[PDB]
């Protein structure tokens, strides 16, 4: 019901060991989210999934396929 | 034509549901909505005077006693304007810095092909589609993203007659039996020719060189 | 990024007396929007770390068997033996950059340990995966085939790379050792990052020294006015002290908005050079460094970023 951060004392949240993309930031790596009998949990932020690529001298990877995607950027004028 | 025509319809289904993609243009309005409601709420503040109404000062007091209390109310309304107009110069400097960023993407991305990465959209740039927006502009970036991956066996050079054969445009790949010439973006296996290879140096100074036979098209054309 | 601060209206303006807190209801919304203007700086300081330091959402790691091109890359790679993950250059970069009156310091969101895991992920994608890590999924390109196609953008064929490859390792490893010796000897190269500490320190030392100044009043103490002078004469002298401290507060919020605009254009210059020079190859002159461009190495820095440009002269 209480947890100590580097930013200060946080009361009313539950510390979990799961790490994923959060919503409401707190600070010093601690970030808060509201998920499911429902409460507000606080945890340490995720950098994304783990990928370790292979390395050798003789191996190359050539892509056989392509996918055309459309992205949208909005700049005010 | 199957991939591109489905990709435009995913933009139309996203903008009809999610309203927070256009919320950068909604922060242009909501900063101005707090700015025009700033000066309305400053008129009710007393500014140290007894009443904020100017008809309740000069008509309720002596004309020596009014000019102290009126000049406090004018100077408090001058400082509310000096917070307003200074805020309008700072927040328009972020718009005009983004207007030069928007005019660069209308010039470089829309009018021609640009080689830039994470400027005209993520991946290899094809073309850009401008769309009009209130207090802004909406860009549609058509990009080239490769998908599937397959691992091949490479080598920097091919030794044949004692001279090293370097690739001109392409890479050297192998399936485990024969050596093929493909490209970095796609898999198109080809027959190794002298026009696709470049001859420089010997085979001793190249680290990782392999032995294969470079096919000469002129050699079947001697007796034919 | 800069130092995120917050100013309390109650403790700074008033001397903890009951007369000063009752007179702020007539003044109203003066210090309400100035706390909202410093809040909107502190949102945009966290957005500068998201655009610059993390280009991609995918984390790449170094393979445990290290032989890369006959080169020594161990100065830019982090040390697994230490509990803090830092490279050999970033140990020198962190050490050269150097009471509560109601002013507090907001802590940053992204910690400096998580900046170096954005740094070691994008150095792993540059060495192992080529230029395709930011433009899509990460391929596997060997390192002898990376620099042959990075010579082809500037007009150099593959004859220079494969014959002279032992002579590149005498040139490249001696040039990167002069960067490590120069940053350890002098702190003046990091002095652009030292001014970000220094201009925030002179802004906080301006604001705490305006309490001792009289601002036209007889005494600068609110307890000395209320316990001595008459209450019709107290409301003149207290309200000169409230108005003069708000003009120092109007000076402080306006100068931090100018420094937020100067640090926005430097971070947009930094997020351009992460997207161009680090994640790809540019043909430009004096953008990715002087001469022809080959590759760029980002490094972690306090309140900023340190670029290492590999140039062809």
UniProtKB/Swiss-Prot annotation, chain A:
<feature type="glycosylation site" description="O-linked (GlcNAc...) threonine; by host GALNT1">
    <location>
        <position position="36"/>
    </location>
</feature>
<feature type="glycosylation site" description="N-linked (GlcNAc...) (complex) asparagine; by host">
    <location>
        <position position="17"/>
    </location>
</feature>
<feature type="glycosylation site" description="N-linked (GlcNAc...) (hybrid) asparagine; by host">
    <location>
        <position position="65"/>
    </location>
</feature>
<feature type="disulfide bond">
    <location>
        <begin position="22"/>
        <end position="31"/>
    </location>
</feature>
<feature type="glycosylation site" description="N-linked (GlcNAc...) (high mannose) asparagine; by host">
    <location>
        <position position="57"/>
    </location>
</feature>
<protein>
    <recommendedName>
        <fullName>Spike glycoprotein</fullName>
    </recommendedName>
</protein>
<comment type="similarity">
    <text>Belongs to the betacoronaviruses spike protein family.</text>
</comment>
């Amino acid at each position: 019901n209480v947890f100590q951060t580097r930013a200060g004392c946080l009361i009313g949240a539950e510390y979990v060991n799961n790490s994923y993309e959060c919503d409401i930031p707190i600070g010093a790596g601690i970030c808060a989210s509201y998920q499911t009998s429902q409460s507000i949990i606080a945890y340490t932020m995720s950098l994304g999934a783990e990928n370790s690529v292979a390395y050798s001298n003789n191996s190359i990877a050539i892509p056989t396929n392509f996918t055309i995607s459309v992205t949208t950027e909005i700049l005010p004028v | 034509a199957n991939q591109f025509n489905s990709a435009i319809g995913k933009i139309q289904d996203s903008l009809s549901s999610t309203a927070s993609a256009l919320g950068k243009l909604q922060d242009v309005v909501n900063h101005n909505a707090q700015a025009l409601n700033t000066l309305v709420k400053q008129l009710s503040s007393k500014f140290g005077a007894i009443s904020s109404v100017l008809n309740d000062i000069f008509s309720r007091l002596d004309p020596p006693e009014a000019e102290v209390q009126i000049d406090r109310l004018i100077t408090g309304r001058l400082q509310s304007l000096q917070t307003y107009v200074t805020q309008q110069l700072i927040r328009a400097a972020e718009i005009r810095a983004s207007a030069n960023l928007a005019a660069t993407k209308m010039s470089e991305c829309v009018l021609g092909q640009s080689k830039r990465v994470d400027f005209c959209g993520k991946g290899y740039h094809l073309m850009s589609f401008p769309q009009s927006a209130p207090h802004g502009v909406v860009f549609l970036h058509v990009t080239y993203v490769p998908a599937q991956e397959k691992n091949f066996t490479t080598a920097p050079a091919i030794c044949h007659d004692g001279k090293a054969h370097f690739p001109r445009e392409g890479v050297f790949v192998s399936n485990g039996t024969h050596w093929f010439v493909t490209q970095r973006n796609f898999y198109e296996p080809q027959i190794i020719t002298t026009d696709n290879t470049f001859v420089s140096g010997n085979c001793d100074v190249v680290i990782g060189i392999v032995n294969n036979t470079v096919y000469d098209p002129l050699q079947p054309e001697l007796d034919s | 990024s800069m130092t995120k601060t917050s100013v309390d209206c109650t403790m700074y303006i008033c001397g903890d007396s009951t007369e000063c807190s009752n007179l702020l209801l007539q003044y109203g919304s003066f210090c309400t929007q100035l706390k909202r203007a410093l809040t909107g700086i502190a949102v945009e300081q966290d957005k500068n770390t998201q655009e610059v330091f993390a280009q991609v959402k995918q984390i790449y790691k170094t393979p445990p068997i290290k032989y890369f091109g006959g080169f020594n890359f161990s100065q830019i790679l982090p040390d697994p033996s230490k509990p803090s993950k830092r490279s050999f250059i970033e140990d020198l970069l962190f050490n050269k950059v150097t009471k509560f009156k109601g002013l507090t310091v907001l802590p940053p969101l992204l910690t400096d340990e998580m900046i170096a895991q954005y740094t070691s992920a994008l150095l792993a994608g540059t060495i192992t995966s080529g230029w395709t890590f930011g433009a899509g999924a990460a391929l596997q390109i060997p390192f002898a085939m990376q620099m042959a196609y990075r010579f082809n953008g500037i007009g150099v064929t593959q004859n220079v790379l494969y014959e002279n490859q032992k002579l590149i390792a005498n040139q490249f490893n001696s040039a990167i050792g002069k960067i490590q010796d120069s940053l350890s000897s002098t702190a003046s190269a990091l002095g652009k990052l030292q001014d970000v500490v220094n201009h925030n320190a002179q802004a906080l030392n301006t604001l705490v020294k305006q309490l001792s100044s009289k601002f036209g009043a007889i005494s600068s103490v609110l307890n000395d006015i209320f316990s001595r002078l008459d209450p019709p004469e107290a409301e003149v002298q207290i309200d000169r002290l409230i108005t003069g401290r708000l003009q120092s507060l109007q000076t402080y919020v306006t100068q931090q908005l100018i420094r937020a605009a100067e640090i926005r254009a430097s971070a947009n210059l930094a997020a351009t050079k992460m997207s161009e020079c680090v994640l790809g190859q540019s043909k430009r002159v004096d953008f990715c460094g002087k001469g022809y461009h080959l590759m760029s190495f980002p490094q972690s820095a306090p309140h900023g970023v340190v670029f290492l440009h590999v140039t062809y002269v």
